[PDB]
């Protein structure tokens, strides 16, 4: 019957729990005890970029670490030259309800999506001097929460239909569909080698996928509530997750469970964005209480605060060369910290 | 700065001008969210996202319905929420009360008022007059309700009282609820929204000055 299958599931879940504990011998907080704390970090607003007239919801750095794109509910994408505050483009969207923003690694395309349940890829380097829609990707049932370019032809999108997809932009079709999440998939982080990607959903669990095979390799479950942000460690063998639990957690892929939790009793607000430093030692986390916190990823200690926004930090990115952190908030502004 | 840099700055200034112009144009309109589970008549109050545009007294209105626990964060800046409820059905009325209680007590709608449309009151009138179905079977506290046709009035006032008691309990005065009684053949449903929106905007104006 169904009871036999459920019993097998319970036995296998207990076997997972046994295997995870048989591999737990020394906490990361215990191997890292005898190394030098990084001390306070003093980061200051170097650039503040006016121009958005609504809440900023997403931003992505470019690969060159100079151009970035920001999405706002005013229904416009803006590409910025961060070294000069200038605006390179202003892309008007068909739907103002935008929640994601992806800059292609090459730099030729940008992507956005939201409550329209469509990913729109935009052609930046054309003739005619305008940015026009290259492809409108339809097929998700729920809203698009994240999208990340793999190359100029592949993009992976996470939706609120409890599903991720792998798209071929030229053909405009779902090449691989990833199922397994009970709740709305809110975040998405691609591995440095782009052969794996991790997902965070409202089921309080995170899943590690294989792009080539379409299979869920691992499921990481420790959060008491929904997961809003996710990001690989630069090594590609770990990731961090932010939740409404007011906590960040670091999960290993090889040990196959949690390593360290980043929480303090003084903060009770959810985490909306997570990114890493170049070396992985710093864990930049953005919060609903209108300021970002920097964590010693290896010691679970607050190394600093980035307090400059008078609404919640909704997005957060670190440059590929690690020079700057860019934070956008619901106060229509985004800032660059160095 | 180089000639190229100066021309880039000029491009940026023109982008700023166009952005500001579009932003002002957007400021001249008012944004509404239409909520209501089903069998409520959302599509027939003002006779991924469906957007309905209308204007009353030369004031532009812009209404959205989707087809909620996560995408409701997007609408923290709308002027009002339009919760439509079928007052004729009693099996689904407690579900409507829980839905309204979720909307009212959401941490992002802590400043958003609700224009409540207790819809389909002609069907309620028929059901109450015929007497086949009784509220007391679904809401026990109705046998002990007296109003502050008489019986149909008692029914509709009781239902509105439940909704306004959900609203009053935890509002704290930062946002209120405007309950209106509507049919499916009513044309005065944009004036209602307009009056409620003038009151909402008056509250926000009196709150920029830290007075209310």
């Amino acid at each position, epitope marked *: 019957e169904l009871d036999q299958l459920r019993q097998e599931a319970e036995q296998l879940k207990n076997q997972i729990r046994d295997a995870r504990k048989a591999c737990a011998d020394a906490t990361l907080s215990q191997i890292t005890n005898n190394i030098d704390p990084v001390g306070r970090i003093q980061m200051r607003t170097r650039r503040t970029l006016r121009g958005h007239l609504a809440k900023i919801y997403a931003m992505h750095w470019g690969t060159d670490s100079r151009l970035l794109v920001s999405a706002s509910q005013d229904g416009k994408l803006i590409i910025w030259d961060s070294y000069t505050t*200038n605006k390179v483009h202003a892309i008007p969207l068909r739907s103002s309800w935008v929640m994601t923003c992806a800059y292609a690694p090459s730099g030729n395309y940008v992507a956005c999506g939201g409550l329209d349940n469509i990913c729109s890829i935009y052609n930046l380097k054309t*003739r005619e001097g*305008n940015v026009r829609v290259s492809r409108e990707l339809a097929g998700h049932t729920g809203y698009l929460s994240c999208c990340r370019f793999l190359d100029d032809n592949q993009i992976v999108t996470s939706s609120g239909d409890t599903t991720c997809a792998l798209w071929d932009i030229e053909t405009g079709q779902q090449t691989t569909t990833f199922t397994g999440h009970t709740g709305d998939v809110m975040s998405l982080s691609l591995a440095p080698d782009t052969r794996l990607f991790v997902s965070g959903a409202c089921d309080a669990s995170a899943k590690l996928w294989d792009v080539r095979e379409g299979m869920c390799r691992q499921t990481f479950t420790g959060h008491e509530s929904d997961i809003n942000a996710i990001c690989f460690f630069p090594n590609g063998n770990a990731f961090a997750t932010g939740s409404d639990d007011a906590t960040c957690r670091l999960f290993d892929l090889r040990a196959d469970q949690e390593l360290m939790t980043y929480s303090h009793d003084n903060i009770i607000c959810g985490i909306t964005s997570v990114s890493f430093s170049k070396s992985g030692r710093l864990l930049l986390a953005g919060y609903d209480d209108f300021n970002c916190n920097v964590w010693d990823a290896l010691k679970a200690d607050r190394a600093g605060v980035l307090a400059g926004h008078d609404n919640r930090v909704s997005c957060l990115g670190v440059t590929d060369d690690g020079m700057a952190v860019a934070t956008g908030s619901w106060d229509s502004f985004l800032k660059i910290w160095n | *700065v*180089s*000639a*190229e840099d100066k021309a*880039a700055a000029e*491009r940026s200034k*023109m982008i700023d001008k166009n952005l500001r112009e579009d932003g002002e144009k957007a400021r001249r309109t008012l944004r509404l969210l239409l909520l209501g589970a089903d069998n409520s008549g959302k599509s027939t109050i003002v006779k991924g996202i469906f957007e309905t545009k209308f204007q009353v007294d030369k004031v532009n209105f812009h209404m959205f319905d989707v087809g909620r626990r996560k995408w409701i964060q997007c609408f923290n800046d709308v002027t009002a929420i339009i919760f439509v409820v079928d007052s004729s059905d009693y099996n689904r009325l407690q579900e409507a009360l829980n839905d309204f209680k979720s909307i009212w007590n959401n941490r992002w709608l802590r400043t958003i008022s609700v224009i409540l449309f207790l819809n389909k009151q002609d069907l309620l009138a028929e059901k109450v007059l015929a007497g086949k179905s009784k509220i007391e079977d679904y809401f026990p506290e109705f046998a002990r309700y007296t109003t502050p046709d008489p019986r149909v009035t008692r029914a509709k006032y009781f239902i509105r009282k439940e909704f306004v008691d959900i609203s009053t309990a935890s509002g704290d005065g930062r946002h209120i609820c405007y309950p209106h009684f509507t049919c499916a053949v009513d044309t005065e449903n944009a004036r209602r929204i307009f009056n409620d929106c003038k009151d909402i905007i008056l509250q926000m104006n009196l709150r920029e000055y830290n007075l209310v």
Partner: single-chain antibody
Amino acid sequence: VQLVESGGGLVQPGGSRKLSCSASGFAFSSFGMHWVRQAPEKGLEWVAYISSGSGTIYYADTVKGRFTISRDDPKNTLFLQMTSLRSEDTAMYYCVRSIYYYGSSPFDFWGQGTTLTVSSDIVMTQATSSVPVPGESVSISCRSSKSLLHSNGNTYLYWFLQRPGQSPQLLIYRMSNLASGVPDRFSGSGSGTAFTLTISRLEAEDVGVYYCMQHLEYPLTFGAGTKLEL
């Protein structure tokens, strides 16, 4: 993309003509547009510049006061009102589109020009006036009076090819970057005040007169030209 220039013909000295370039195929309003003329058997000379939005207008010192540039964005026309026409104005008047943002490729399309027949500054010196050279690799040098390397790290050298009876074509922008549609055989290198454009595997339909331009500061100055004849 199409820029069709009109006007042109014979004018006695002291007259006045209006050249019109009609733009089709691209967003004209987003482009700053140049007038670049070429004497009957000489090099390229820059006349005037009108920016997108008509905010900024620059003129050459030779034609300041007696030339006037304007654009009609709804009709996609660029105008050059010429007054007090002299005998040094007999040239082919090219219209060039240029867009300026981070990573742009200015001077990327040149219209087929019109012939008018009327009867400080960086000195770009391309000393090699003619070099004979197919299937081999040849290099062209351009020298600048001052360093083209700005403190922003950008060095503003542009390379153009004018094949026989054809409008000149952008090969390299900022002495490293190839234009779109230009085969990878070309490349450019150098430092301030010393530049080079090497072409590997020289082929037919790839010989003409090569020019170097500075966009470091106005007035834009071209080079004398290097002619590659088989």
